Amino acid sequence: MIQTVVKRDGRIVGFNEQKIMAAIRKAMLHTDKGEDTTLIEQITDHISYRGKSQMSVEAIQDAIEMELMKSARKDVAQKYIAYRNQRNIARKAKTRDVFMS
Amino acid sequence: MIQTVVKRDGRIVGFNEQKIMAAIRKAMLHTDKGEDTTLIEQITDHISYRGKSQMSVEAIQDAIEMELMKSARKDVAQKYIAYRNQRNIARKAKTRDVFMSIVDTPAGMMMKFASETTKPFVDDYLLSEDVRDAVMHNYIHIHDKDYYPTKSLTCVQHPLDVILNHGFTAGHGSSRPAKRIETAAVLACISLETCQNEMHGGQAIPAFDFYLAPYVRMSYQEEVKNLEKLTGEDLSNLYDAPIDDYIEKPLDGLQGRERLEQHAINKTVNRVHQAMEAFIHNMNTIHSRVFSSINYGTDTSAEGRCIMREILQSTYQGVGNGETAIFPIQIWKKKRGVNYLPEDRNYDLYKLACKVTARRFFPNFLNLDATFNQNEKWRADDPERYKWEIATMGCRTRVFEDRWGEKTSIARGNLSFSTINIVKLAIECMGIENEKQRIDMFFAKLDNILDITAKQLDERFQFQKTAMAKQFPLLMKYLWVGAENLKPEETIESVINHGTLGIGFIGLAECLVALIGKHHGESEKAQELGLKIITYMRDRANEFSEQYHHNYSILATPAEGLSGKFTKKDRKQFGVIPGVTDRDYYTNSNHVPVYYKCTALKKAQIEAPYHDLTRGGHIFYVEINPSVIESVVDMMDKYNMGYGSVN
Ligand SMILES: Nc1ncnc2c1ncn2[C@H]1C[C@H](O)[C@@H](COP(=O)(O)OP(=O)(O)OP(=O)(O)O)O1
Numbered sequence: 232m233i234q235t236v237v238k239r240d241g242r243i244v245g246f247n248e249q250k251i252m253a254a255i256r257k258a259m260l261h262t263d264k265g266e267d268t269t270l271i272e273q274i275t276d277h278i279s280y281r282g283k284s285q286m287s288v289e290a291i292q293d294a295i296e297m298e299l300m301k302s303a304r305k306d307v308a309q310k311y312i313a314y315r316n317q318r319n320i321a322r323k324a325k326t327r328d329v330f331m332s
Numbered sequence: 333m334i335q336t337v338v339k340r341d342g343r344i345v346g347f348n349e350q351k352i353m354a355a356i357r358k359a360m361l362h363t364d365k366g367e368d369t370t371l372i373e374q375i376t377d378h379i380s381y382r383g384k385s386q387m388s389v390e391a392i393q394d395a396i397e398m399e400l401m402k403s404a405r406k407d408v409a410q411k412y413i414a415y416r417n418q419r420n421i422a423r424k425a426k427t428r429d430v431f432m433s434i435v436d437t438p439a440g441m442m443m444k445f446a447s448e449t450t451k452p453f454v455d456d457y458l459l460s461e462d463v464r465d466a467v468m469h470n471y472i473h474i475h476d477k478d479y480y481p482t483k484s485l486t487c488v489q490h491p492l493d494v495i496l497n498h499g500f501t502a503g504h505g506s507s508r509p510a511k512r513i514e515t516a517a518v519l520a521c522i523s524l525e526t527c528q529n530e531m532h533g534g535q536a537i538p539a540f541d542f543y544l545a546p547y548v549r550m551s552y553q554e555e556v557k558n559l560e561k562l563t564g565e566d567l568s569n570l571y572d573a574p575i576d577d578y579i580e581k582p583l584d585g586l587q588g589r590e591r592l593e594q595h596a597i598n599k600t601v602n603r604v605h606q607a608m609e610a611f612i613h614n615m616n617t618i619h620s621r622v623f624s625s626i627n628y629g630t631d632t633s634a635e636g637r638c639i640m641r642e643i644l645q646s647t648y649q650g651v652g653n654g655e656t657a658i659f660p661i662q663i664w665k666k667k668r669g670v671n672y673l674p675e676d677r678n679y680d681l682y683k684l685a686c687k688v689t690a691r692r693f694f695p696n697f698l699n700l701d702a703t704f705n706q707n708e709k710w711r712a713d714d715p716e717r718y719k720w721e722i723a724t725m726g727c728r729t730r731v732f733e734d735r736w737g738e739k740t741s742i743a744r745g746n747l748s749f750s751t752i753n754i755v756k757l758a759i760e761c762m763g764i765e766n767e768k769q770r771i772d773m774f775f776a777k778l779d780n781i782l783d784i785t786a787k788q789l790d791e792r793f794q795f796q797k798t799a800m801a802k803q804f805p806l807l808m809k810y811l812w813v814g815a816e817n818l819k820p821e822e823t824i825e826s827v828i829n830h831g832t833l834g835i836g837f838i839g840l841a842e843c844l845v846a847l848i849g850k851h852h853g854e855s856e857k858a859q860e861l862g863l864k865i866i867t868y869m870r871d872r873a874n875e876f877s878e879q880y881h882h883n884y885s886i887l888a889t890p891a892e893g894l895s896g897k898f899t900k901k902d903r904k905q906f907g908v909i910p911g912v913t914d915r916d917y918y919t920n921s922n923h924v925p926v927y928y929k930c931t932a933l934k935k936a937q938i939e940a941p942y943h944d945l946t947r948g949g950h951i952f953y954v955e956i957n958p959s960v961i962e963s964v965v966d967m968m969d970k971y972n973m974g975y976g977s978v979n
Pocket residue numbers: 236238244245246247248250251254255288291292
């Protein structure tokens with residue numbers, strides 16, 4: 232499994248998979264079909280395996296994106312990618328630097 | 333196959349297979365590995381077959397994405413989807429506000445951008461854990477949180493005499509002391525506008541008539557001097573000659589050195605009228621381009637009366653072609669022994685004030701006779717007695733008392749104020765059928781929420797100091813109590829502990845209905861319980877003030893930015909309850925609900941005994957001929973009403 236997760240800042244934390252569940256549930260909540268709990272627990276189990284001891288947030292995001300494309304519900308993949316790209320674009324602002332200094 | 337394609341605008345065009353290929357190719361030329369048409373041909377052939385003989389652009393792009401994220405090349409799909417979404421966002425920005433959703437006048441848009449980019453970062457990185465959790469679950473509202481990183485204060489009462497007597501230097505702009513009535517009003521407007529940018533609240537000028545009184549005599553002297561220059565006479569005895577009043581009289585029928593004693597008064601009145609007419613228009617347009625409040629009424633002199641009767645007749649004609657003026661907010665100061673009784677000095681000014689309030693919504697009325705307002709250091713012969721008369725703002729805020737200083741309302745202001753929701757505190761304990769246990773649990777949770785809000789206010793105070801004096805040019809050099817011994821690069825922590833920390837509440841009729849059968853406006857037991865809980869909060873505030881070495885007060889929140897942001901988040905969690913969460917907006921802090929029909933007398937009688945426990949600020953709003961306003965003021969006099977705003 233995975234024990235070390237390095238966030239965007241560079242810090243190190245554990246591997247609470249409830250984060251993954253909440254992410255892939257909030258993605259589904261904005262679709263048209265609805266929410267199914269048998270796919271969340273399958274994707275989380277498949278990704279809490281075959282990975283490395285230490286993983287980055289970008290790596291886990293990319294893995295979830297790749298696994299969610301080749302699995303039944305594909306109307307969630309477009310929403311997930313669009314929201315992720317929007318937040319990536321919004322992150323490039325210098326708000327953190329000016330806020331902290 | 334496919335014969336026709338419908339564009340986004342509405343045009344109908346023939347199907348062109350060389351359009352899908354060139355679109356997939358531009359998404360294959362931005363990845364690590366590109367490709368030739370081996371897969372492009374298969375995708376296009378699959379899309380062309382299995383069609384409806386007429387397709388839209390979006391209906392084709394959906395199929396392109398579905399095919400791309402299905403065949404061995406899932407890296408081109410994630411470049412296609414993102415670019416399509418970016419183009420959609422770009423096209424939606426021609427008539428909408430997409431950029432605000434992601435996070436009309438250009439200045440307003442920039443300010444909204446700043447507020448939205450500042451609020452979450454403060455909510456995360458500056459607040460402590462307990463206060464953050466309390467804020468998240470719809471418990472306490474931190475007013476003006478966007479201005480949190482700017483260690484800013486709320487408001488202040490301007491000592492206009494300093495500026496008018498010595499001049500001011502703010503940046504590279506300096507201004508000398510005034511010498512007439514046409515410059516004092518302009519300088520007052522400049523001071524208000526300048527200090528508005530340095531604070532996130534309103535601006536008020538106490539003793540409006542006293543400050544500008546010395547500049548009515550100067551205009552008279554200048555007119556007399558100019559009048560003696562074309563005649564060669566000697567009018568040196570008229571400079572200090574007492575004047576009963578600056579009333580304008582017709583000039584026909586007189587000759588000699590008593591005829592020119594009236595031309596001067598006439599032109600002085602005209603100039604003062606023009607100055608007071610420009611003040612209103614300036615303070616209205618600047619706001620329409622700033623919360624401005626002026627309080628006056630307790631001056632007995634030929635000059636102060638002239639100012640008070642010119643302002644009260646320029647506020648009568650309105651602005652422009654007769655339109656009413658929204659700003660400035662004008663307040664009348666009524667005292668027993670000055671202008672109240674029919675034989676007092678300024679009864680006619682009070683009559684004019686009552687007349688103007690019946691056409692132009694202003695002025696308001698501040699009662700100086702109340703127990704909490706009276707000051708022992710007041711004597712109606714000192715020319716500087718205005719320092720001991722309480723003044724208020726248009727934002728319903730009072731700062732009079734002090735535990736380490738004088739009991740004045742000049743050069744002091746509010747530091748911060750937060751609001752506590754209690755309707756949820758009542759719904760959360762509505763399940764219990766036994767009243768005693770329900771009340772006990774209510775009080776137990778109220779204690780915890782009060783402790784949390786006190787800790788939050790203390791932490792905001794600790795952050796608001798360590799602010800250099802240079803960050804507030806005008807405020808900490810001329811407009812604050814000890815702001816005359818502070819170096820530009822010195823922390824303001826030596827004078828900051830003179831303000832007020834406000835704890836407010838929103839809704840009490842709802843809380844009692846969620847507690848007992850009815851509200852305070854119908855049942856006596858509910859009124860007693862509400863008075864009990866308000867008194868409990870006041871005693872806890874006194875304990876907090878004694879413990880944290882600060883000043884705490886209880887406020888009736890104006891409900892200007894929190895009218896709705898408490899009931900929707902309670903509907904979404906507790907469901908519709910009859911008479912509690914089924915109205916849209918919660919009722920105000922301690923008022924009478926707008927639907928429970930009452931008369932002015934009953935409403936005043938029930939609402940009066942709360943003003944003694946709401947030292948931080950309170951209002952008496954009555955909805956509706958000078959006689960009606962006279963009756964309202966008399967009703968205020970009969971009880972301990974502090975501030976009234978009948979219209
Ligand atoms: N503790 C963790 N363990 C494993 N994966 C994590 C963890 N935290 C984040 N991730 C990964 C998987 C999540 O889908 C993705 C983003 O989750 P999330 O916690 O919302 O991000 P974040 O760090 O940006 O949070 P926030 O915006 O609340 O600060 O990052």
